[PDB]
């Protein structure tokens, strides 16, 4: 097993971002606990306080063409969601898969996902999905 690395969900976004480090923590009077995180490739202006249970987890992993078969329907995926204004990684679920015929070099499978945020759906290739460990 490799050393655990993490991603965290931004409150000004709802997308998930690789975490560079955890600076400190705090406990609100409600009892709510939060850690302060630094996002990889970002200066300290972008640091956030996030809940550990809902907004921090093990990094999603890009899936190799060779293992597309491990991905299944109903699965949770970190999906690179391309739009005009923003391109970002959001959670989604696999509604359907159309399998394809391909060598390990490249995957031509088609995954239909439902984004958790809005419930909207999009079809994605392997290149835009990551799997949970």
């Amino acid at each position: 097993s490799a050393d655990l690395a993490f991603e965290a969900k931004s409150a000004r976004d709802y997308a998930w971002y690789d975490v560079s480090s955890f600076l400190t923590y705090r406990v609100l009077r409600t009892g709510e606990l939060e850690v302060r995180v630094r996002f990889s490739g970002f200066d300290n202006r972008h640091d956030e306080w996030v809940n550990v249970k809902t907004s921090v987890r093990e990094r999603s992993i890009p899936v190799e063409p060779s293992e597309c078969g491990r991905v299944n329907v109903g699965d949770l995926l970190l999906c690179f969601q391309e739009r005009e204004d923003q391109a970002l990684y959001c959670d989604g679920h696999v509604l359907n898969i159309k399998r394809g015929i391909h060598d390990h070099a490249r995957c031509n499978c088609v995954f239909l996902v439902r984004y958790e945020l809005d419930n909207t759906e999009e079809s994605l290739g392997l290149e835009r999905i990551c799997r949970r460990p």
Partner: peptide
């Protein structure tokens, strides 16, 4: 590696 995200 992941796709290079671009923020709003």
């Amino acid at each position: 590696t992941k796709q290079t995200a671009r923020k709003s």
